[PDB]
Assembly symmetry: C2
């Protein structure tokens, strides 16, 4: 089995797993929609009670499985719980990352397409004060790129450029993955992460210089870091905060587990896990938090910025920020730097989300790395046509896999590891080889607090939020639901085939 | 490997493979739309130049492959042509029958649902002369069953009864298939075919007694068997005739090949093949041709009958015929007999179209028959939800697989067998063990005439018919296209996995 070559490489790869579009696109919107500073208390609390403990659990499960030649959850769940149902539950650890890959790589490709166009100056040009005369050209720019519907049909019409750029993006992902763990992902991480940090810091500095009749970037920071204890009672904010924690730390995606499966059996995971998690949070709250929101508030004031944030998930990052930059000298190049940053952030995350499928094909079906990477790319590429052409298909996948799925799977993996496998055995497995030990208190958090926190969260979520979605959606949501259910059935069949190959193999040995 | 137990069983199973919904539903509509007697000249000619020769070729390929433990085209094509491209072309021999199964079993389930409702007298009751006051209740009956759209959305809403009946239908197919070739399909064929023949003969007799102010059943027969040489020039009629020949004989579906793979290496296929083909044609032109058309013409006259035939593919069989029967004493029970006949016709054909997937899983992935049958049923059942809920999805699948696909695959299999593998080797393989020899003239038909006939047909088809369809369709056709393209990719992946299992297997032996 492959192993990470160096401790630094392991850390930067894991940090690259985490630090993604979620830090720079998702976090600012989530925080802005939820009162800014009012979002941060629940967010910090979720990091401590969910983010940290689950991170350690996934590193431990991955390392544990890797020692026996397994990196994905169908096998790993079965090692922890010798029951047919463990294998079936384990399928979600292949299904979630596959579905997420299907829309995440597409969005990643947009950032590359925008970077290219901004670099070469093929961008819109607003009419030099109206907040709409400047924004409209950038809205139309995004709409033409991805092909937003102009009529009644729920169909998207992406530009030829966007389509070719997606192909290029897939090629770049494959070029890294095909080289494997140490020579591919690890080597790229050592180049991408420092680049990512430098670009982000530069952008923060530039944004911090923004001042208009409507305010300064300082006003944006104050909105984000001023608590509102009257929101600590709103369940919606807690759900948002926990959802962001999962998404941001790559928890429940099967991605941390698979990376950790390449950590040597004896190697520390306590300090490494904590370090990766902490690096992500710094990139999120300090870097991601200090770019988009302050820029928007500086130019539009808080009320308008919040309204922009609620407007859509991509409005702030693909329309508003570049429009704001365009009002400044060298703003087109600043736009390039922003999208280049997003691309490297996306890329280091997308190689992580496709590795579980690759590991399963290698580990369980005994495919060569070459074949495993290429077939994985093929399935993602083919499937992405749904997200490229059917309006709101992206939203549907992001809901079932990237939102509900990850939280559900997080609770599942914790129950299996800390309840079925054995709390004391799990505790011992986590700490084994630790450069530091996990604080004793976290034993009771993991065993009692985290599961109960998530269980209540999911129930409240399910009672007062989900029914609206099932009842109040356009019929086309069923196209995406049908397809991703088929994907689950497909992966279940592959797990079945893996069992049969193993049985026939043992009969020969 | 399993083998057919008796020669009679083999013949009735193969006859059951062929004699299906195509004889009793498809043939009458095709003949009626194309001038009746004007359809029959091209039809007879296609039977001689295409139907017969291709039947022998498929029996031969199946028997040839079966002798080496292979029953499906990915392997068999490779045996005949040691080239990676042979395996890929061979995938169509799994893809076509899978796609056809996905809509064919659903339609088959309707005939069971109708049989049940007609048996128990839960049927509509027209107002005792208006040709519309009688037909409307039966149209509404079908529309409520399958759930035809009442608004603008291209969505179907099948009754709960129709859904449960589809489940039952799948169960019945599985119950036969799970028992295998000799104890399952062969044993059922010996019961179903005689029953089928008796029901059909009875129905023909009953229809032959129909006489109204508008005409007699005799008028229907005259319309069907009166030549119109002025149509021998119309290409459309030839395309229709050849398409019906393929569909009716189960040619290009991979189904005849797979059944023949269970024929012993030395056993005759010349007389057996010819006998199965001839039995089908008798059931089609004598039985199928003498039920629906004469009944409709008797009650409505020719012009109206033809108009009904053009109305839809299911209007004649599910609406018009039962409505006509309802005007006669014991007509509800006659309706039951009709739908019972259709069901047995459908059932013996659907077990044939699912056996290729079963054989591939058994032969190439080494699954047990139990697992192979159940996974096949699961894929068909899941996929059928597309045909059940998306308006016109059925039409799209029937076009790509059941119409274009089978003719394309027929030309492919002939080219591979008679051109690449070797005309003389193919000729020798067909005749080997023959109780009779194939007439010498058919060597030149197979090698030169059949391929050229099909090639010209396909080109003319492609030039003057296909473009309208690609350009003039609702956007929802892409949902079905996307899905069945995914099915092809899925099956291609399975063939790839089969190669890898074989390679690893040989390395051990
Ligand atoms: C691998 C699955 C392929 C299914 C059909 C995909 C057809 C893609 O079609 C392409 O889409 C682009 C984006 O709209 C257009 O710019 C191109 O003109 C068009 O050829
Ligand atoms: C960075 C590598 C990808 C480049 C893909 C370019 C695809 C060509 O895109 C074409 O560009 C033309 C000129 O701008 C436009 O007028 C056309 O509408 C567009 O189809
Ligand atoms: C479920 C996803 C299916 C995607 C099917 C894509 C089929 C592409 O089809 C092509 O797309 C082009 C761009 O939209 C259009 O300009 C063409 O008219 C159309 O033929
Ligand atoms: C919500 C969970 C927050 C946990 C924060 C734990 C901070 C560390 O807490 C410390 O842990 C050490 C090791 O067990 C102990 O020796 C110390 O007494 C204790 O203060
Ligand atoms: C492609 C086949 C789609 C057929 C299924 C569509 C059935 C219509 O069901 C629709 O489902 C939506 C989502 O749950 C709901 O919001 C709507 O209220 C409901 O009418
Ligand atoms: C195996 C794939 C399942 C996908 C969702 C299928 C849901 C079927 O839904 C069922 O459809 C029937 C027919 O309209 C209705 O009569 C039933 O009330 C309904 O529960
Ligand atoms: C033959 C075995 C399948 C029988 C399935 C019956 C499913 C029940 O079907 C129900 O029947 C009721 C009474 O007719 C109707 O009023 C309901 O609308 C219908 O849902
Ligand atoms: C591509 C095929 C997807 C099929 C999805 C079926 C989802 C079933 O969904 C259910 O269907 C019932 C009958 O239509 C409706 O009455 C319900 O409102 C709907 O929720
Ligand atoms: C379009 C193809 C129609 C073929 C019909 C062939 C009918 C049989 O034709 C016969 O075949 C025998 C065996 O070769 C010969 O000995 C006879 O002389 C010949 O008449
Ligand atoms: C589910 C995703 C569907 C997106 C693809 C729809 C693109 C619209 O393309 C449509 O295709 C039809 C069939 O070729 C043609 O008849 C129409 O002229 C064309 O507009
Ligand atoms: C695509 S890996 C999961 C998401 C990633 N952690 C991000 O924040 O973007
Ligand atoms: C479903 S097997 C192919 C069709 C069959 N020969 C029929 O006529 O119905
Ligand atoms: Na992150
Ligand atoms: Na990343
Ligand atoms: Na037939
Ligand atoms: Na049949």
């Amino acid at each position: 089995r492959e192993h990470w070559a160096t401790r630094l490489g392991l850390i930067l790869a894991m940090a690259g797993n985490a630090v993604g579009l979620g830090n720079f696109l998702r976090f600012p919107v989530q925080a802005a929609e939820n009162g800014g500073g009012a979002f941060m208390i629940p967010y910090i609390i979720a990091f401590l009670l969910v983010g940290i403990p689950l991170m350690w659990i996934e590193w431990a499960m991955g390392r544990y499985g890797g020692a026996q030649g397994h990196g994905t959850t169908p096998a790993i769940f079965y090692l922890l719980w010798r029951n047919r149902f463990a294998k079936i539950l384990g399928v979600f650890g292949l299904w979630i990352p596959l579905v997420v890959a299907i829309y995440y790589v597409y969005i990643e490709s947009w950032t590359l397409g925008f970077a290219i166009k901004f670099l070469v100056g093929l961008v819109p040009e607003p009419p030099p004060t109206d907040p709409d005369s400047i924004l409209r050209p950038f809205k139309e720019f995004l709409y033409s790129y991805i092909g937003v519907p102009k009529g009644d049909e729920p169909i998207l019409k992406p530009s030829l450029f966007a389509y070719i750029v997606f192909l290029i993006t897939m090629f770049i992902n494959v070029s890294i993955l095909i080289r494997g763990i140490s020579k591919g992902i690890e080597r790229f991480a050592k180049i991408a992460m420092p680049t990512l940090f430098i670009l982000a810091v530069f952008l923060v500095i530039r944004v911090f210089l923004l001042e208009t009749p409507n305010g300064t970037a300082a006003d944006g920071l104050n909105f984000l870091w001023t608590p509102d204890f009257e929101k600590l009672k709103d369940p919606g904010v807690w759900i948002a905060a926990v959802g962001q924690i999962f998404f941001t730390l790559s928890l429940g995606f099967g991605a941390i587990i698979t990376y950790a499966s390449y950590v040597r059996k004896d190697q520390d995971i306590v300090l490494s896990g904590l370090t990766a998690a902490t690096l992500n949070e710094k990139a999120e709250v300090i870097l991601g938090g200090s770019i988009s929101i302050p820029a928007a508030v500086a130019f539009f004031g808080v009320a308008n910025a919040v309204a922009i944030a609620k407007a859509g998930a991509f409005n702030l990052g693909f329309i508003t920020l570049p429009a704001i930059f365009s009002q400044t000298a060298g703003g087109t190049f600043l736009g390039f730097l922003w999208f280049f940053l997003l691309f490297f952030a996306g890329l280091t995350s997308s190689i992580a989300i496709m590795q579980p499928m690759i590991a399963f094909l290698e580990d369980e079906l005994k495919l060569s790395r070459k074949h495993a990477v290429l077939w994985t790319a093929a399935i993602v590429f083919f499937s992405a046509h749904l997200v490229m052409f059917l309006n709101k298909s992206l939203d549907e996948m992001d809901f079932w896999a990237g939102t509900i799925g990850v939280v559900f799977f997080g609770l599942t993996e914790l129950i299996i590891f800390f309840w079925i496998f054995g709390a004391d055995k799990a505790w011992e497995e986590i700490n084994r080889g630790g450069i530091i030990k996990v604080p004793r208190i976290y034993y009771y958090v993991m065993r009692y607090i985290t599961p109960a926190f998530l269980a209540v969260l999911l129930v409240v979520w399910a009672r007062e939020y989900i029914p609206k979605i099932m009842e109040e959606t356009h019929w086309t949501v069923w196209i995406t639901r049908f397809y991703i259910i088929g994907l689950f059935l497909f992966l279940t069949f592959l797990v079945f085939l893996a069992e049969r190959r193993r049985n026939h193999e043992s009969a020969g040995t």
